[model samples]
Target: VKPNYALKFTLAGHTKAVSSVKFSPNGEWLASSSADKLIKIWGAYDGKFEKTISGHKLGISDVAWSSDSNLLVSASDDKTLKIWDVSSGKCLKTLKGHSNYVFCCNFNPQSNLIVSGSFDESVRIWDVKTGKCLKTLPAHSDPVSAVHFNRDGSLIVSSSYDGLCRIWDTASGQCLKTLIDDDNPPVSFVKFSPNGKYILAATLDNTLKLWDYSKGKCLKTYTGHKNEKYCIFANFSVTGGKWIVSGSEDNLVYIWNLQTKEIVQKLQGHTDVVISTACHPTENIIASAALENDKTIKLWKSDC
Candidate 1:
């Protein structure tokens, strides 16, 4: 059999642009955010709408599920990050400290800490239980677009419109190393490999650069996109750790071989800009969010 690839389902109901979508830790539920100012949950396997959590004053830019899957974190253009109970669909906490639109937010893998990036040109760390702002990192001069925690939860990586990707110590909120590529286009996304040994940062110049985290140096560059790419999401395969997946604005998701630093496959289907992507925590499946023509969420499956 040729590798089986197809559209699994179309998630409809959002009236405006969908911004982001993420799967719960166990891959039981899917959480999606939209410019309609709504964050909705769905049954991941069956594609059933579970609940709609609404409270944001502006468009929700990002959504993330806590490590335990009991809570969901959403950042909005309203400049606030709201934590919601996944079971009851109730808002538990509203974290407020950003001066402008909050762009992205994620939970630490091991602690009750939430990290948020904002157009205010800073990234803030918050206590999830107390709803208190713990630290503000002002390293990026421009808007901070994305923030993520390493698998070990010991370090945080951030990408900004200022064209710099920085690693910070989560415990002390101190800048550890700055990864720069003056010749490459400005970075739009940065994420650590599943093992926390390598860092991958995607640039608008249509390139994905890999870095050696311990040495703070660029290890390899993978290229194949046709145009400027906006956001890139990557994760390693659980069984082999030899492959990586990246969703790009060129309406394609590229899978790469880690050892050879070569493109293994180009998964394409989105009709518009591919903004966000996530891999199934344990399965060979992948999901992507795109600017569809009808203003709905389009879900795609990979050929494994």
Candidate 2:
């Protein structure tokens, strides 16, 4: 069955482009990072402004919450990562090791380790408590765009400007496999499934490739967006892994059924590029960020 998706909310207040928007683990808070160099937290259920985190010297690149959603780690062009305590609104730790702009970072909640990617063409693993660099994986040849650890935290997946996606051993920091699509376009973003078997990577050449990383094979390719040069991502529906939803450069959001590979819904409201999207942690709610002069984020709901 195809669920009817409709816009539920129009979030605003960013003077510049809103690059990314995400919901907290329990779906109680929404976080947005923008080119205006501000990160604002909003109450998702109550729809109120919670607080603003401002410290980055340049535009904020990305933000990730801890597993328990108590802390947030933010990446920035200032070549540093800042750990913040949500309720207290205090800077917990300032990790300074990346030589270039920090691109992305994610928390491995189980181990309490943060893995970060940077324009320095490297991935650094940091200790959450001590704020020390535990390990650095200089695996990519160019600027690292995205990074993620598997569900079990046993492996790491990363994409770079060199048009390659790599699977790494989390313990040894060894590159296990390099995934290059037939077209070999530069990868924009990548994500691991909830079950940790399949990897979906969005590339700049307008394709999303689903890789069976266990066998190092590209199982299928899905494309419905004009994703030419942005860090757009595809996320599995919270109901189950049966559907994939992604933002598009064509001023629309697309949802496809995994079994059918056909777009079930093309959500439209914004007049510019839809570059950031995410599913609610445990519901059928979706939040999308638009670029190219549109300073709004739209909430989409599904009647599943």
Candidate 3:
């Protein structure tokens, strides 16, 4: 069945381009980060304002919620990652080591460790409690774009501007495998699949490729929207990965069937490029953030 998706809320609070928007893993809150150096928390159900978190000296690049939804970690252009307590709305810890802008961050399934990528061409693993750098891997030859842990928290995948995706072992910090497309297009975003058996990567080449990392092969490719200029991402539908949703450079949100690779929906509201999108953990809800011209986050709901 095709769910009828509708725009429910046009959340406008950020003063600058919203770089990323994510729903908590428990599906209770929505968090947004922006170039304005602020992170705002909103109600996942109605888009009601909750609180504002401000600590980064520069623009915030991304924000990731803890597995339990009680904490948040934000990457920033200030070259640091700050862990925030959701209930008290306070900065619990500041992780510093990167010599360049921190591009992306994610918490492991255990929520005890965090992995972050930086323009320093490195990936750092941090101990959540001590705020200490446990291991630093010289991950890439160019700026790292995205990083994520596998479902079991045993492996990590990182993508880079060098046009390569590398998988790493969590314990030994070893490069297990490197996957690259024949065209050598720069990768913008990468993530492990829900089952942890595959990887999905978004490239500036205007396509999303699903890869069987174990076999080192591209299993499927989905394309319809333009993604030639910005570092936008495509995410799996939260209702169970039957579809993929993405923000496009053409200023529209595109949803495609996961199996058929057919464009199922095109949502229009933003006037500029949509840079990032996130699906709710347990519902047919979506949150999307856009570039400078359209500093807004839009909430979309689906009727199954």
Which is the leading candidate under TM-score?
3
lDDT of predicted model 3:
0.92
**True lDDT of residue 10, candidate 2:** 86
For 49-152, candidate 3 gives per-residue lDDT tens digits of 89999989999999999988999999999999999998998899999999999989999999999999999999999999999999999999999999999999
User: Could you tell me which 10 consecutive residues in candidate 3 have the lowest summed lDDT?
Assistant: 232-241
Please give the lDDT score for candidate 1: 0.80
> What are the TM-scores, per candidate, against the unseen true structure?
0.93, 0.96, 0.98
Model 1, 160-273: lDDT tens digits are 878889999999999998886656467788888887988888887887788997887788887776436455555564533456667666777677776677777776667766
| Candidate 1 collision pairs | none
Best by lDDT: 3
Error of 2 at 241 (Å): 7.1
Task: For model 1, state the Cα shift of residue 225 in Å.
Answer: 1.7
- Each model's lDDT comes to 0.80, 0.85, 0.92
Worst 10 residues of 2 by lDDT: 233-242
Tens-digit per-residue lDDT, 1-304, candidate 2? 7868788888888888887888899789888888788888887755577888888889888888888888888899899998998888788899999999998888884848899999999999899999999899986888888888899888889998889899888888888988865567788898798899999998888888788988888877777778897888678885744788888888899998876778888998988888788788876788888874898888888767
Report the error of model 2 at residue 42, Å: 1.5
After superposition, which runs of candidate 3 have C-alpha atoms over 4 Å from their true positions?
Answer: none
Q: What lDDT, from 0 to 1, does candidate 2 have?
A: 0.85
